[PDB]
């Protein structure tokens, strides 16, 4: 049937942000899943767990008679997807069990993995999500084969239908650099936010770049990746040698007997897929990747023979079963213990990516290291495993079980405790109106805490108002944050902060974190007023304020609004049109269409644009709440034009005078012009809707506001 | 963005059952429209109406100084998109101003009709939905205009994003047949459930089929698509000359003038299409259809001159300035007036398709009738518009405000007013133990009472249990109620009810509908106790009994379900597979996936199967309340592949022994392939999931039995 997309290819689409709708979970509106998991056994989760590691099923039977590596792939490539760029992807939502994931490539006979988990997941039932699951079976799978990890956190719920992400416009499978929707240009820079050098595949190509088996070029792809997911070269090395220090790769035969992934797979497969018609298609006979490696020589045990064999042959070329290129140790024994059968053994393997380590310069300093010295490389790889499979899962408040590390790391983005009495509700009114007493306008305030505040993205719960971030490097300096205007009323707030703080008894004070927020409220508050509306605005104290040295000036970096049309900014060109990103940027804060709608033309009437521009302030009241912005934008008198400078700008002039009225940009005329986002302002534009207007729009900012604030949850 | 539409093309869409969620609907959860409109000032909007159909707008000069032809066709085509094969389409969503429809050839320039509207959808806000607007516009232009309507009622609220429906499969705007995606096959067959002949037109080719200006065969396509928008001949003879009593058509100059169409357009055109180059584009060039007729000499007011015009004169064949066939009365005088120059007169002339109700035989002697005795004419259009107009509304108890017509319809499909005292919540416990003890089974019960409830669509929302028409021709003989087991049901439920409504005072008793529901009800608890648990399923009096003579026979025929997974039934082969007719019937009925999951898995075990089939009986206590459906489905330990006599059939084997269990469906193992639904039968087996099966199934029975009950409302 032919639907909207095809007609208009290139309309937004707004149904990205109602996905996940309460019509397509299948637990009740009050379900709370951090609830049911603190109650989940978790000791008897992992007792069974550990059973199942060496409990073989014969519709795919265990490798060595464990399936510990097996485990430790689903976990690793069920965390392997997540892209510092926008935060999403990740284990933290368990889509592996989606589509397209479920169907990639690189996630072939995973779908074995999670079909053998089924069994603990039935018996725990809502208890523990997959999305924890997949990970705790990972780390139980370390534990087993004797390999302390660093700790595990439960409380990612689970998702019941796929997230909308961007992984790239190829329409091939595994599509090599180049082609017409090439994800590489220049000198091999791989296109944001995209953390993959092929459609399908978690990071890079095992045989090497596009397939050239070269390891120092492999290398640049590995270090590239990476850093997309946020690992630096020590994380980088100590999570690929310790995860091929268990396992072996697939790789029997011919890749064309492998049929059709799961998504492609007949209804009698019952949601498996990949079925091979290599003699037996499974256990000795298994073919997932094509290649055909098994790294040490006890793929059951943590050992440190990895870096041993790395550092101990030499290596020559050859081709697995299936025809991909892989590595062989000259002139070694038959050392490595087959998977199946107790009489065979065969030399000591090695992907390209694997000799990456060795051959890359600073990978082989840190490899040497780990070598010589095997604690700091289980210690690194430890810490690295906890980073890999908690990256995405945001504050140290969402944390939760028996298992939680203690130790507080850089990248959590951490927040001290708070440790005083915290602010109650004359304490805020009293601070509310200093603030207004200082002079600080609407406009100042607005843009301030809405720059403190639109930082958090849902993908990887990082940002938000919470640790006075705003205050510190980098984002005191961003250009969407006018650093200039933003010192000025930081000092007006420090000022009024100090002078409260040290009126105090008891230990009473208030953060940064929280007054700029309390001030933002103050002036929704004299918006409304002047408007000629009472309104109060909810505010919850408890936010604290994190130092520069708990704020990783380099991770920070993505978080930077490049595009943020809530303040009508756009940092540079984009061939993304600014509306696209718009919807982008409402769907990171967790806004639905209505909330999107009106919290931009509120914001528009209360001055919080970049530069003071008039572009979208359609009223006659600035820094008043009112819903001028609708009635404005969809009266028919006036007609709108590009402008001839700037096809992105528009006038919008009288139709009968020619008077210039207005200008707008695509932001904002966009709800003029999208027929739902026009529905939308048309129900704020009417005559009964002042009301509605500010009501709705103070709901939506105080949304907003609490986004990071979990330790309320 | 590649998404996995383009990966798997033919992947089950579940993405239709979660439209219309709570975070789209800009208006709060409680927002009740009926309430809303019926304090309106209805009147104050009519004469807001009347007012605006004579106050012409420079950017869209009304023709003849007067709005109302404009206004009539706009109504005419928000109506007219409807199709009696599945009710979808019609104006009861307002969907004409979402895609697609908006953007359709055939609602060229109703764009300019809408914005026309908005000042006053603009002053009275959310006490005057834009779909009850468009209707009203139409009804106050035909008032205003000289014609008399039979009523309006209000209360068809306002979506908020575009329904899914199946417009055909052309890739084309207005392709002709014959195409590789034809509607059309055999001897000018129309595909159901497609209600026009070319993608984009509301019913048919106004020069003739596929452009053929044939007036006695574009007759044919004329009845043909009428019929199926549940026209009859009579009232389409009447709706077509009724309709072009008034107005004109737009073809000034050639259709390459005219520019892109909404959904296209450049944002600056702020939702409007169509921009015609075409000298001043608008007013006495406007083009729309590309023709050029003036059907009457006085084209703002009612009259009997279409007739007098299509049977007074001889007619011969031209072409409109843009190139389109047309028809001119040659001998005619000059006495149709010009739409802008009052010194400017046209000879009559005619389309195709006007002159069909002359030149086909059956619809002359109507035509002929009616131009003999134009008070028929009157009266069938007035009960024809009527009809259009409200088709799709439901039944008479969703109809407000003052302006209701007090005349009961034959197509309304009729409830008697109740008029005695309702059994009470004791009442219904004494008939519930009647049932069970009158040897009636828990899989009659169910299957009886689903029988009568799942008639029902939201699309058009006819169908239901109310009225009892289970018991009346044509429902009693359809082969998915099971005809002789249906009869011994309503017989034995019958004496039930005569001695109970024979045992009571005071006027109180109880309906067949009401029974037939409540008796559901029992043999759900009864299944429930079956299994362990006591549960009390809810039930809500006031259902009433339609008689034979109140339910027309054809118009039923289209509620037949020939394809119901719910039962596991096909009534025959189709080239859709049977699980896209579930996710389909899920629609209708209102269900969300969970829903659907949760309802189908319980009747399964309950025996709700049309003719006791064993396929997806997943359970060894039939007739229990119990989860087994999904528990068995799941167990990792059945194999299962299609049979050789019929590759829809499975075989569920034991995966050691080779042992026969189960059979089942395509409907019944998508549940165990479909990644999403698989997600959603993993939560109803679980071991922590009794509970909340019998909760979940307990609601969505109680949801499906109370479908049509606008009463409760
Ligand atoms: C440069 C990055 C990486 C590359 C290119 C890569 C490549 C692969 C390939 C091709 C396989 C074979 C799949 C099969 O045929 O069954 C595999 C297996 C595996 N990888 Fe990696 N790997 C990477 C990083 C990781 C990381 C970060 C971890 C975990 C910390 C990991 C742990 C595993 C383990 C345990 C297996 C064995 C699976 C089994 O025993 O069934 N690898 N790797
Ligand atoms: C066989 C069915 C019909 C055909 C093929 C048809 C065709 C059309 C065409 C091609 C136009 C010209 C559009 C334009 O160029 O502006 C139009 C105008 C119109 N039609 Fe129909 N029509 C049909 C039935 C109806 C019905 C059922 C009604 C209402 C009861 C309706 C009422 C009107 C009115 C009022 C206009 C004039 C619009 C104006 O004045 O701007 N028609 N018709
Ligand atoms: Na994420
Ligand atoms: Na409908």
Same mark, same amino acid.
């Given at each position: 049937?032919?639907?909207?997309?095809?007609?208009?290819?290139?309309?937004?689409?707004?149904?990205?942000?109602?996905?996940?709708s309460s019509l397509s979970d299948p637990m009740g509106k009050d379900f709370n899943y951090a609830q049911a998991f603190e109650k989940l056994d978790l000791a008897a989760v992992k007792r069974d767990l550990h059973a199942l590691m060496t409990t073989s099923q014969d519709w795919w039977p265990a490798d060595f008679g464990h399936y510990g590596g097996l485990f430790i792939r689903m976990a690793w490539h069920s965390a392997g997807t997540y892209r510092t760029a926008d935060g999403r992807g990740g284990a933290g939502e368990g889509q592996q069990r989606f589509a397209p994931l479920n169907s990639w490539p690189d996630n072939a006979n995973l779908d074995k993995?999670?079909?053998?988990?089924?069994?603990?997941?039935?018996?725990?039932?809502?208890?523990?999500?997959?999305?924890?699951?997949?990970?705790?079976?990972?780390?139980?799978?370390?534990?087993?084969?004797?390999?302390?990890?660093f700790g595990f956190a439960g409380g990612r719920?689970?998702?019941?239908?796929?997230?909308?992400?961007?992984?790239?416009?190829?329409?091939?499978?595994?599509?090599?650099?180049?082609?017409?929707?090439?994800?590489?240009?220049?000198?091999?820079?791989?296109?944001?936010?995209?953390?993959?050098?092929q459609m399908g595949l978690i990071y890079v190509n095992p045989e090497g770049p596009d397939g050239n088996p070269d390891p120092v070029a492999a290398a640049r792809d590995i270090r590239d990746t990476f850093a997309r997911m946020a690992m630096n070269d020590e994380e980088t090395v100590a999570l690929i040698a310790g995860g091929h220090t268990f396992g072996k790769t697939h790789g029997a035969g011919p890749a064309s007997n492998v049929g059709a992934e799961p998504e492609a797979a007949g209804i009698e497969a019952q949601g498996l897929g990949w079925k091979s018609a290599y003699r037996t298609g499974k256990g000795a006979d298994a073919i997932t990747s094509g290649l055909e490696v098994t790294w040490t020589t006890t793929p059951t045990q943590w050992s440190h023979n990895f870096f041993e064999n790395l550092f101990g042959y030499e290596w020559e070329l050859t081709k697995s079963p299936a025809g991909a290129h892989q590595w062989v140790a000259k002139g070694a024994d038959a050392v490595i213990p087959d998977a199946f059968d107790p009489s065979k053994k065969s030399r000591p393997t090695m992907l390209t990516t694997d000799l990456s380590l060795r051959f890359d310069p600073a990978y082989e300093?840190?490899?040497?290291?780990?070598?010589?010295?095997?604690?700091?490389?289980?210690?690194?790889?430890?810490?690295?495993?906890?980073?890999?499979?908690?990256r995405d899962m945001g504050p140290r408040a969402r944390y939760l079980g028996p298992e939680v590390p203690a130790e507080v790391l850089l990248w959590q983005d951490p927040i001290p405790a708070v440790d005083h009495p915290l602010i109650d509700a004359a304490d805020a009114a009293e601070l509310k109106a200093k603030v207004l007493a200082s002079g600080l306008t609407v406009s100042q305030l607005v843009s301030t805490a809405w720059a403190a505040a639109s930082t958090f993205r849902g993908s990887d719960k990082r940002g938000g108002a919470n640790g006075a971030r705003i205050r510190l490097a980098p984002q005191?300096?961003?250009?969407?944050?006018?650093?200039?205007? !933003?010192?000025?009323?930081? =000092?007006?707030?420090?000022?009024?902060?100090? +002078?409260?703080?040290?009126?105090? %008894?008891?230990?009473?004070?208030?953060?940064?974190?929280?007054?700029?927020?309390?001030?933002?409220?103050?002036?929704v508050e004299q918006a409304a007023k002047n408007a000629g509306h009472a309104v109060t605005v909810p505010f919850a104290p408890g936010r604290a304020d994190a130092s520069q040295e708990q704020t990783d000036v380099e991770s920070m970096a993505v978080l930077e609004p490049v595009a943020d049309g809530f303040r009508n900014y756009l940092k540079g060109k984009y061939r993304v049109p600014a509306e696209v990103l718009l919807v982008d940027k409402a769907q990171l804060l967790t806004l639905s269409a209505p909330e999107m709608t009106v919290l931009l033309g509120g914001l528009r009437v209360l001055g919080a644009n970049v530069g003071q521009?008039?572009?979208?302030?359609?009223?006659?009241?600035?820094?008043?709440?009112?819903?001028?912005?609708?009635?404005?934008? !969809?009266?028919?008198?006036? =007609?709108?034009?590009?402008?001839?400078?700037? +096809?992105?700008?528009?006038?919008? %002039?009288?139709?009968?005078?020619?008077?210039?009225?207005?200008?707008?940009?695509?932001?904002?005329?966009?709800?003029?012009?999208?027929?739902?986002?026009?529905?939308?302002?048309?129900?704020?534009?009417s005559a009964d809707a002042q009301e509605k207007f500010v009501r709705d729009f103070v709901a939506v900012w105080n949304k907003v506001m609490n986004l990071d604030r979990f330790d309320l949850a």
């Open positions: 049937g032919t639907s909207n997309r095809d007609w208009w290819p290139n309309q937004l689409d707004l149904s990205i942000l109602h996905r996940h993995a999670r079909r053998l988990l089924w069994p603990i997941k039935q018996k725990y039932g809502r208890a523990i999500s997959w999305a924890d699951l997949l990970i705790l079976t990972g780390n139980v799978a370390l534990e087993s084969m004797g390999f302390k990890t719920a689970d998702t019941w239908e796929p997230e909308d992400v961007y992984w790239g416009s190829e329409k091939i499978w595994l599509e090599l650099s180049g082609g017409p929707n090439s994800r590489y240009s220049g000198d091999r820079q791989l296109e944001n936010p995209l953390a993959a050098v300093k840190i490899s040497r290291r780990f070598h010589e010295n095997p604690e700091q490389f289980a210690d690194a790889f430890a810490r690295a495993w906890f980073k890999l499979t908690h005191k300096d961003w250009e969407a944050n006018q650093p200039e205007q !933003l010192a000025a009323v930081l =000092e007006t707030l420090e000022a009024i902060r100090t +002078a409260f703080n040290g009126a105090q %008894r008891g230990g009473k004070q208030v953060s940064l974190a929280d007054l700029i927020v309390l001030a933002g409220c103050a002036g521009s008039r572009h979208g302030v359609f009223t006659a009241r600035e820094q008043a709440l009112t819903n001028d912005f609708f009635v404005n934008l !969809l009266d028919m008198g006036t =007609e709108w034009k590009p402008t001839a400078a700037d +096809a992105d700008v528009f006038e919008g %002039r009288d139709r009968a005078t020619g008077e210039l009225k207005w200008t707008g940009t695509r932001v904002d005329l966009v709800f003029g012009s999208h027929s739902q986002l026009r529905a939308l302002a048309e129900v704020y534009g």
